[PDB]
Design a protein around this motif. Structure first.
Motif, PDB file in Angstrom:
ATOM      1  N   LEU E  39      44.350 -31.108  -8.892  1.00  0.00           N
ATOM      2  CA  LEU E  39      44.941 -29.912  -8.303  1.00  0.00           C
ATOM      3  C   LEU E  39      46.449 -29.864  -8.537  1.00  0.00           C
ATOM      4  O   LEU E  39      47.031 -28.782  -8.589  1.00  0.00           O
ATOM      5  CB  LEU E  39      44.599 -29.832  -6.812  1.00  0.00           C
ATOM      6  CG  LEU E  39      43.123 -29.600  -6.481  1.00  0.00           C
ATOM      7  CD1 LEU E  39      42.922 -29.474  -4.981  1.00  0.00           C
ATOM      8  CD2 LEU E  39      42.570 -28.366  -7.185  1.00  0.00           C
ATOM      9  N   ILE E  42      47.897 -28.535 -12.216  1.00  0.00           N
ATOM     10  CA  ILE E  42      47.803 -27.106 -12.494  1.00  0.00           C
ATOM     11  C   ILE E  42      49.168 -26.454 -12.273  1.00  0.00           C
ATOM     12  O   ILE E  42      49.697 -25.792 -13.169  1.00  0.00           O
ATOM     13  CB  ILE E  42      46.682 -26.419 -11.690  1.00  0.00           C
ATOM     14  CG1 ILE E  42      45.347 -27.139 -11.889  1.00  0.00           C
ATOM     15  CG2 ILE E  42      46.592 -24.947 -12.080  1.00  0.00           C
ATOM     16  CD1 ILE E  42      44.257 -26.729 -10.926  1.00  0.00           C
ATOM     17  N   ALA E  43      49.740 -26.674 -11.084  1.00  0.00           N
ATOM     18  CA  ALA E  43      51.095 -26.232 -10.774  1.00  0.00           C
ATOM     19  C   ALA E  43      52.060 -26.642 -11.883  1.00  0.00           C
ATOM     20  O   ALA E  43      52.808 -25.808 -12.379  1.00  0.00           O
ATOM     21  CB  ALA E  43      51.553 -26.729  -9.419  1.00  0.00           C
ATOM     22  N   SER E  46      51.559 -24.675 -14.808  1.00  0.00           N
ATOM     23  CA  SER E  46      52.017 -23.320 -14.544  1.00  0.00           C
ATOM     24  C   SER E  46      53.534 -23.222 -14.691  1.00  0.00           C
ATOM     25  O   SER E  46      54.050 -22.161 -15.031  1.00  0.00           O
ATOM     26  CB  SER E  46      51.562 -22.832 -13.193  1.00  0.00           C
ATOM     27  OG  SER E  46      50.174 -23.070 -13.009  1.00  0.00           O
ATOM     28  N   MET E 112      50.092 -17.961 -10.068  1.00  0.00           N
ATOM     29  CA  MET E 112      49.278 -19.167 -10.139  1.00  0.00           C
ATOM     30  C   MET E 112      50.059 -20.376  -9.623  1.00  0.00           C
ATOM     31  O   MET E 112      49.486 -21.257  -8.983  1.00  0.00           O
ATOM     32  CB  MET E 112      48.771 -19.437 -11.559  1.00  0.00           C
ATOM     33  CG  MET E 112      47.690 -20.514 -11.607  1.00  0.00           C
ATOM     34  SD  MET E 112      47.067 -20.962 -13.247  1.00  0.00           S
ATOM     35  CE  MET E 112      45.770 -19.744 -13.469  1.00  0.00           C
ATOM     36  N   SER E 116      48.504 -22.634  -6.615  1.00  0.00           N
ATOM     37  CA  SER E 116      48.231 -24.037  -6.888  1.00  0.00           C
ATOM     38  C   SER E 116      48.994 -24.940  -5.925  1.00  0.00           C
ATOM     39  O   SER E 116      48.442 -25.930  -5.456  1.00  0.00           O
ATOM     40  CB  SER E 116      48.531 -24.393  -8.318  1.00  0.00           C
ATOM     41  OG  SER E 116      47.502 -23.946  -9.178  1.00  0.00           O
ATOM     42  N   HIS E 120      47.212 -27.603  -3.387  1.00  0.00           N
ATOM     43  CA  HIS E 120      47.614 -28.998  -3.493  1.00  0.00           C
ATOM     44  C   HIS E 120      48.119 -29.509  -2.143  1.00  0.00           C
ATOM     45  O   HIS E 120      47.781 -30.625  -1.759  1.00  0.00           O
ATOM     46  CB  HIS E 120      48.625 -29.171  -4.634  1.00  0.00           C
ATOM     47  CG  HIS E 120      49.208 -30.536  -4.759  1.00  0.00           C
ATOM     48  ND1 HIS E 120      48.437 -31.637  -5.067  1.00  0.00           N
ATOM     49  CD2 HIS E 120      50.479 -30.971  -4.631  1.00  0.00           C
ATOM     50  CE1 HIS E 120      49.199 -32.706  -5.100  1.00  0.00           C
ATOM     51  NE2 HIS E 120      50.470 -32.322  -4.843  1.00  0.00           N
ATOM     52  N   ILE E 265      43.971 -24.197 -18.959  1.00  0.00           N
ATOM     53  CA  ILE E 265      44.824 -23.452 -18.044  1.00  0.00           C
ATOM     54  C   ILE E 265      45.613 -22.392 -18.813  1.00  0.00           C
ATOM     55  O   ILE E 265      45.709 -21.244 -18.372  1.00  0.00           O
ATOM     56  CB  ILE E 265      45.719 -24.391 -17.206  1.00  0.00           C
ATOM     57  CG1 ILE E 265      44.912 -25.209 -16.192  1.00  0.00           C
ATOM     58  CG2 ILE E 265      46.850 -23.625 -16.532  1.00  0.00           C
ATOM     59  CD1 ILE E 265      44.009 -24.396 -15.285  1.00  0.00           C
TER      60      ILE E 265
END
Ligand SMILES: CC(C)=CCC/C(C)=C/CC/C(C)=C/CC/C(C)=C/CC/C(C)=C/CC/C(C)=C/CC/C(C)=C/CC/C(C)=C/CC/C(C)=C/CC1=C(C)C(=O)c2ccccc2C1=O
Ligand SMILES: CC(C)=CCC/C(C)=C/CC/C(C)=C/CC/C(C)=C/CC/C(C)=C/CC/C(C)=C/CC/C(C)=C/CC/C(C)=C/CC/C(C)=C/CC1=C(C)C(=O)c2ccccc2C1=O
Ligand SMILES: CC(C)=CCC/C(C)=C/CC/C(C)=C/CC/C(C)=C/CC/C(C)=C/CC/C(C)=C/CC/C(C)=C/CC/C(C)=C/CC/C(C)=C/CC1=C(C)C(=O)c2ccccc2C1=O
Ligand SMILES: CC(C)=CCC/C(C)=C/CC/C(C)=C\CC/C(C)=C/CC/C(C)=C/CC/C(C)=C/CC/C(C)=C/CC/C(C)=C/CC/C(C)=C/CC1=C(C)C(=O)c2ccccc2C1=O
Ligand SMILES: CC(C)=CCC/C(C)=C/CC/C(C)=C\CC/C(C)=C/CC/C(C)=C/CC/C(C)=C/CC/C(C)=C/CC/C(C)=C/CC/C(C)=C/CC1=C(C)C(=O)c2ccccc2C1=O
Ligand SMILES: CCCCCCCCCCCCCCCC(=O)O[C@H](COC(=O)CCCCCCC[C@@H](C)CCCCCCCCC)COP(=O)(O)O[C@H]1[C@H](O)[C@H](O)[C@@H](O)[C@@H](O)[C@@H]1O
Ligand SMILES: CCCCCCCCCCCCCCCC(=O)O[C@H](COC(=O)CCCCCCC[C@@H](C)CCCCCCCCC)COP(=O)(O)O[C@H]1[C@H](O)[C@H](O)[C@@H](O)[C@@H](O)[C@@H]1O
Ligand code: HEM
Ligand code: HEM
Ligand code: HEM
Ligand code: HEM
Ligand SMILES: CCCCCCCCCCCCCCCC(=O)OC[C@H](C)OC(=O)CCCCCCCC[C@@H](C)CCCCCCCC
Lengths: 51, 102, 533, 24, 535
Positions: E39, E42-43, E46, E112, E116, E120, E265
């Motif tokens: 998780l 992803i951030a 991004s 996003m 995210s 998280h 992603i």
């Protein structure tokens, strides 16, 4: 690391030379403080404006 | 200089084992497709990223007395129609009150 | 107290991140104590000041080419048609309290950055610190200088004044469109059309505040990491070998010195940033295509490129209804210098055939050919720099303007040849001067007349003597040698006290004994360490 | 602490074991 | 001949920097393989896309309030007086090939990023990954969240359209000049005069592209360094202790997975930025003080702040010819949720009186009070978020606009209590669900119908059996338990082959044998390691 040589600066205590050297370092720091205060006072109170 | 032999041997064995165990070298079909696909994607992405700020400098955009022409062929002195009168004007000052006079 | 708070803080830190072994290693790292190793710090200290002042300027600046009328406080420019950038630059200097000082410090720091980089580069080249395993670091540095030279160019072009305007028009628009085949396309890609355009200042602003500083920061980080984890070089001397470092530990000697040096650099920059005028943009006026002045000169780190344009002959070609202008030559000529500076170590490695690990530096006098090459390069740089200022030299110093161009043209092929020869001979002569002391000793400067009428000069041998008097000759070890007897302590111990009043005799004796006793110990320790290897 | 002689007598299999064991 | 090529360029590196042991250590780092631990990246993925898109939108934008007349390609706004920022924003979308796509991807990635971060944060809170020695990391993450919120807010205010202008007039200007002592001084310091001014857009541009991203980058670096050198926590299971890590090495399994996840992603973000419209600035107009629309919504990560304003009553005070407006209550409130968020671990440490250097995670069902508190907080957040869009819900769904305000106002004190109670009970019930299987076994779903006419269900014991056939009770070890017989291997492969044609039998038999033997070996290895650990 090995550190082959290491010695203090003033072996003989109670000397006038050590005291004199102690007061030389302080003067520069006092000058810095005074100049900082001067900076504050001149930045607050001075015309600063275009003529 | 150089790290001891043990470290060199172990690190080389690790990398070689990682490559060899994957069995990627034995599989030519999928090892080639990956390269081709990555190349195609890279080319497309790069052309899309860069192709936005490319301009043709020889396109007719300036209206003249002989049709539209490119920028570098023209100036302020090119006639816009036949028999146009263009004056030689001086500039003195007075930003808002007739900066140009005959 | 503080014997309980510090222990608690240390316990809390150590129980969570366990950094004691890795933090002791950093405190025990040793660094050579030299004055030629503090030249690389100045640049760094100049960069930090460029950030702090660079952020303050971002809170007030507006980078737009939208045309407006001034209507401000500065009267001589009251009704003039200008751009938003120029108006905002005037506002910073006249309307915001302490803005002029800040933007002067910015420019002064920008100059110091380039000057320090040049001096550091000179040191690295002449001492031979670019040899393996550090020839990867040199390349990194070679990029940084280039990045530091365009970053400054984009910076003084932001106010959009007459001087910088004409500079942009000549050095970025004229040269761009002179290149063959892919020339006009590149021009229209950069400017988004014809020269003046509408998007140049915003683009330059974004490029100046964000991208190039980011790349510079990353590359500087890489530079410093490589320096840290590869160790520092050292000059040959007593107790120095190819597999050790002699100096002082980081804690607490090195850190205090570094901090003090940073403070003094800041002091100098701040003192000269508010006592001398730099870039008075209000005297210049906004950029107009139909206006020009006499000077038309860039910053000092750009003048060689302009002098190369100023000196090169008007040679053009016209193949099959096309044009190859003069400005092409410069574009090629500038590319070679950058291509002949990035990869020097490999050239020298190929030439001399030396491919060994090196940790000990070289004295410029011991490498005559490299020294001569460096001297001739510096001579060419200086001549190209002074040829950009020919139109001010002619006015101040009473020389023909036609004469200066020819002087430069002949000089750019004549002066380096002289400099090479002189440098070579001078280096060899310094070598011969170092062999005279190792054979006879230091000349004391004392003449004596013998009974039979001879005049002799007293020598001080640096080693054992034979059974006739003349010393046993010593070998060269790549280290400096004394030439004056005062540097060997042969004379001088003034009576201790103030400047006007003395101290008691007992204090003087006790203080003079201790110094001599301490002085023996260091030499003895170094000798013992050298003898154990 | 294997010698230079033994390190040439090991296959790729047990060198990875040794590296891992050194790292923990 | 790459064997000779790689053997020469490898020696050249070791003889100059000698990074053999240092990189060999990094190739052998073990990372736990749990979906929930993906998780956080992803951030990160991004953020990178936000940088590449942020550099492509820095070649065309002009931040200025200088008023101009459009005279462009877009006909419905021909002759309208706007600013330079708005005109350049229109130019990006209409005059540059692929500019609209780029700015759409920028905005989608911005959304996003925040989503995210929220997910998280939820993961970190619920599993107790903040206890010790991982408090500073929590704090850093909290600051990151706040910075991300403000970074996002300053971003969509740059085009200077009607929505952003109305938002910035009400939030950044109206709220600012309400603070009791320093109300008007701070306003005039920020804007350099009255509200509109002439320096706000350049200042916001410099703040959005340079400073906040720099701080974010530094804090992210620190975050990742702490995670790397503090050896990522794991979950209770077979072969897991307080002093080890179970998973896979970085080379080559972890790196390939990370790369593939990044690629997917990027794929999702790119696919989403072409098929869905976001932020159409041409349907709006340039900002005018005497113009407004119906919506007036900020981005979803700012919606709770806006919904708090809509629901709080009109309570003001007038001491000694002064004024304390309504907007004060939110300014105090908004900074009170932050303060309670950063210093949560210390609060819980003080309450429970526990600090014992935990490396093993907790299942949320095992900690009822914390789970209930988290659920209550999430409920309050959701209600505040849905209160901001009470005018859109009242239009699409047939409900009074006056009724929605009262619903939200009453709800913001009632709904959290209900959520707390339900969450507590639900967690305890999930606990009790685990004690039934350790005692009786997995219910197979099969009824027996004994000779004397009794109905029983067949159970599958998870351990040793007693002489009477009833299973020996097992102890709870903080690990999940099976509840379906199909997850235990009660079902083979349909048969080796394609979807339409089978393969020769011998191949199927050999493949089944190999797979079964491999499963035996893996289980045996885990069991042996677990047995040797606890001696
Ligand atoms: C036992 C045994 C024997 C085995 C061991 C053996 C062993 C280990 C030994 C082997 C080791 C060996 C053999 C090693 C050998 C390694 C080796 C030989 C390596 C060689 C490396 C090498 C040759 C390096 C290549 C160098 C290189 C790539 C060069 C770079 C070229 C560069 C830097 C060019 C840049 C040019 C450039 C960018 C030009 C820009 C010009 C333009 C367009 C600018 C125009 C321009 C602009 C744009 C302005 O704005 C402007 C503004 C104001 C004034 C002027 C201007 C102006 O002129
Ligand atoms: C992705 C992206 C867009 C990023 C862009 C990145 C970028 C270009 C950066 C921009 C910076 C940004 C944006 C950050 C914003 C930060 C921010 C908002 C702060 C505002 C600042 C502010 C309000 C000003 C206050 C004024 C004030 C009180 C100033 C105090 C000055 C201070 C505190 C000075 C600190 C000095 C300092 C940090 C020194 C460090 C020295 C270092 C690192 C040296 C290390 C070092 C030493 C010391 C050696 O001597 C050495 C010798 C030989 C080999 C190696 C080394 C070596 O590594
Ligand atoms: C509201 C308003 C107006 C705003 C004001 C802002 C404000 C007041 C803020 C104050 C904040 C406060 C109070 C904090 C103070 C903090 C402070 C002192 C700041 C200093 C900042 C500063 C000095 C600036 C320096 C900036 C700078 C140049 C830093 C460099 C940082 C660097 C080099 C970071 C590298 C990051 C990077 C390259 C990322 C790559 C990401 C990739 C590829 C991921 C790889 C990766 C993967 C894939 C994993 O999954 C993973 C999983 C587990 C562990 C590791 C990894 C991993 O590494
Ligand atoms: C403008 C416009 C049109 C749109 C915007 C464009 C835009 C947003 C760009 C995004 C581009 C982007 C983010 C692309 C990502 C591409 C990715 C992540 C693909 C990689 C896929 C992949 C094959 C990953 C697996 C990684 C692998 C195979 C690792 C192999 C490997 C690697 C990677 C080593 O470096 C290495 C170094 C030393 C020893 C060993 C290894 C090693 O084993
Ligand atoms: C507007 C306006 C007024 C303009 C802005 C002015 C501006 C840019 C401000 C700069 C201010 C600034 C840079 C302050 C420096 C303050 C300094 C140098 C501190 C005093 C010196 C001092 C206390 C002496 C003792 C020395 C000490 C304690 C060392 C500090 C120290 C430093 C600073 C290192 O660089 C370092 C690098 C590597 C290892 C260790 C150290 C280390 O310990
Ligand atoms: C089938 C052709 C492509 C083959 C595939 C590989 C080549 C593609 C690579 C680049 C992709 C280009 C796609 C961009 C579209 C295009 O091609 O533009 C056409 C121009 O004709 C062309 O064949 C362009 C030829 C490219 C010339 C190369 C340019 C030379 C280099 C030097 C330019 C500098 C690039 C920076 C690199 C420098 C590095 C130096 C170290 C029409 O121009 P135009 O209609 O007049 O202007 C429009 C605007 O109005 C509209 O706003 C919008 O900007 C566009 O739509 C634009 O085209
Ligand atoms: C997010 C969930 C939150 C959970 C918390 C639950 C708390 C519920 C509290 C109940 C709220 C009560 C609202 C009363 C405040 C109020 O003012 O309400 C009036 C009209 O009362 C009503 O309708 C009462 C409506 C009751 C609504 C009950 C809410 C329960 C729903 C929201 C739960 C469903 C959750 C959604 C399910 C989705 C997920 C599925 C699980 C409108 O005034 P007005 O319209 O001006 O009437 C004028 C005259 O006066 C005047 O004579 C004249 O006749 C006119 O001028 C007239 O206009
Ligand atoms: C942005 C410009 C630069 C900065 C900030 C910088 C900074 C530094 C610093 C602080 C050192 C520490 C060692 C010392 O004080 O001498 C150093 C060493 C070094 N720099 Fe530079 N430098 C720069 C440019 C260059 C250039 C232009 C070159 C060569 C072209 C270069 C090559 C080196 C090398 C080789 C060393 C290590 C030499 C040694 O180990 O003794 N650097 N640099
Ligand atoms: C490598 C270090 C830097 C150099 C060499 C440099 C160069 C320059 C120069 C020469 C000027 C002109 C000043 C004047 O005309 O009075 C300037 C101004 C400016 N610089 Fe920088 N700069 C540096 C760092 C930065 C950074 C990091 C930023 C952004 C954070 C920045 C933003 C600005 C701004 C906004 C101006 C305003 C221009 C003006 O007032 O005339 N600078 N810079
Ligand atoms: C990393 C966190 C970031 C977030 C969440 C973010 C968010 C946003 C948002 C939501 C917008 C307005 C979207 C629209 O409606 O068009 C925007 C605009 C913009 N951002 Fe960012 N941004 C971020 C970072 C950056 C960075 C790092 C840069 C520069 C390097 C940048 C450059 C821009 C530019 C130039 C615009 C122009 C406005 C436009 O063209 O529409 N952003 N940003
Ligand atoms: C930009 C925002 C953030 C990024 C990019 C980020 C990234 C990451 C990543 C990749 C990890 C390791 C991967 C994983 O286990 O999930 C991680 C771990 C962690 N993050 Fe975040 N994070 C961010 C914000 C936060 C927030 C908001 C918090 C909590 C308030 C937080 C606290 C932690 C903690 C405690 C860990 C430790 C992981 C563990 O022990 O298992 N981070 N972060
Ligand atoms: C760029 C240079 C690349 C050269 C392209 C080809 C030139 C196109 C010529 C078209 C033209 O104009 O008519 C010829 C001109 C009227 O007569 C002369 O050319 C004077 C004769 C002396 C020229 C010596 C040639 C050697 C030059 C090289 C040393 C430079 C290479 C670098």
């Amino acid at each position: 690391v090995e550190t082959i040589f290491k010695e203090p600066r003033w072996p003989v205590p109670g000397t006038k030379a050590e005291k004199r050297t102690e007061r030389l370092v302080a003067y520069w720091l006092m000058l810095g403080g005074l100049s900082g205060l001067a900076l504050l006072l001149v930045f607050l109170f001075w015309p600063w404006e275009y003529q | 200089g150089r790290s001891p032999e043990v470290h060199r041997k172990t690190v080389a064995a690790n990398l070689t084992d990682a490559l060899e165990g994957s069995t990627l070298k034995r599989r030519k079909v999928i090892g080639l497709s990956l390269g081709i696909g990555l190349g195609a994607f890279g080319a497309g992405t790069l052309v899309a990223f860069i192709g936005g700020l490319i301009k043709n400098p020889w396109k007719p955009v300036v209206p003249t007395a002989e049709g539209k022409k490119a920028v570098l062929w023209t100036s302020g002195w090119t006639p816009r129609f036949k028999g146009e009168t263009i004056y030689l004007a001086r500039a003195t000052g007075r930003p808002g009150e007739s900066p140009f006079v005959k | 107290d503080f014997a309980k708070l510090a222990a608690a803080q240390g316990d809390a830190i150590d129980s969570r991140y366990h950094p004691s072994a890795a933090v002791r290693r950093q405190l025990n790292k040793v660094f050579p104590t030299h004055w030629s190793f503090l030249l690389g710090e100045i640049a760094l200290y100049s960069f930090i000041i460029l950030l702090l002042t660079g952020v303050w300027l971002t809170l007030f600046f507006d980078p737009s080419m939208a045309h407006v009328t001034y209507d401000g406080v500065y009267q001589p420019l009251r009704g003039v048609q200008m751009s938003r950038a120029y108006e905002t630059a005037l506002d910073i200097s006249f309307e915001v309290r302490g803005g002029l000082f800040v933007r002067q410090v910015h420019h002064w720091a920008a100059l110091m950055f380039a000057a320090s980089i040049m001096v550091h580069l000179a040191r690295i080249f002449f001492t031979g610190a670019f040899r393996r395993p550090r020839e990867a670091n040199w390349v990194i540095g070679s990029l940084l200088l280039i990045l530091a030279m365009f970053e400054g160019f984009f910076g003084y072009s932001l106010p959009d004044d007459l001087l910088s305007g004409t500079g942009i028009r000549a050095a970025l628009s004229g040269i761009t469109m002179g290149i063959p085949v892919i020339g006009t396309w590149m021009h229209w890609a950069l400017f988004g059309g014809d020269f003046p355009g509408e998007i140049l200042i915003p683009r330059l602003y974004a490029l100046h505040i964000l991208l190039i500083p980011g790349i510079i920061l990353a590359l500087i980080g890489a530079h410093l990491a490589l320096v840290w984890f590869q160790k520092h070089t050292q000059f040959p001397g007593p107790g120095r070998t190819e597999t050790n470092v002699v100096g002082v530990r980081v804690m607490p000697v090195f850190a205090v010195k570094s901090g003090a040096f940073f403070a003094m650099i800041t002091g100098v920059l701040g003192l000269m940033g508010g006592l001398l005028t730099i870039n008075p943009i209000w005297n210049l006026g906004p950029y107009k295509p139909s206006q020009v002045s006499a000077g038309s000169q860039p910053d000092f780190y750009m003048m060689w490129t302009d002098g190369l344009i100023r000196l090169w002959p008007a040679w053009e070609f016209y193949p099959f209804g096309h044009t190859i202008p003069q400005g092409v030559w410069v574009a090629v000529g500038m590319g070679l210098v950058f291509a002949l500076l990035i990869a020097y170590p490999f050239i020298e490695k190929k030439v001399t055939g030396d491919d060994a690990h090196h940790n000990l530096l070289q004295r410029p006098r011991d490498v005559p050919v490299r020294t001569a090459i460096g001297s001739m390069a510096i001579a060419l740089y200086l001549l190209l720099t002074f040829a950009c200022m020919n139109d001010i030299i002619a006015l101040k110093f009473h020389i023909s303007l036609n004469a200066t161009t020819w002087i430069g043209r002949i000089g750019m092929v004549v002066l380096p040849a002289i400099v090479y020869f002189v440098a070579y001979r001078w280096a060899i002569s310094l070598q011969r001067s170092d062999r005279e002391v190792l054979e006879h000793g230091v000349e004391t400067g004392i003449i004596k007349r013998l009974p039979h009428g001879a005049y002799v000069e007293l020598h001080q041998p640096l080693g054992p003597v034979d059974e006739h008097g003349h010393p046993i000759p010593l070998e060269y070890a790549g280290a400096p040698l004394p030439k004056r007897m005062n540097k060997l302590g042969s004379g001088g111990a003034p009576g201790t006290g103030s400047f006007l009043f003395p101290d008691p005799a007992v204090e003087h004796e006790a203080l003079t004994e201790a110094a001599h006793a301490s002085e023996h110990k260091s030499l003895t320790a170094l000798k013992e360490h050298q003898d154990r290897i | 602490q294997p010698t230079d002689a033994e390190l040439a007598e090991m296959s790729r299999e047990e060198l990875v074991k040794l590296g891992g064991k050194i790292d923990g």
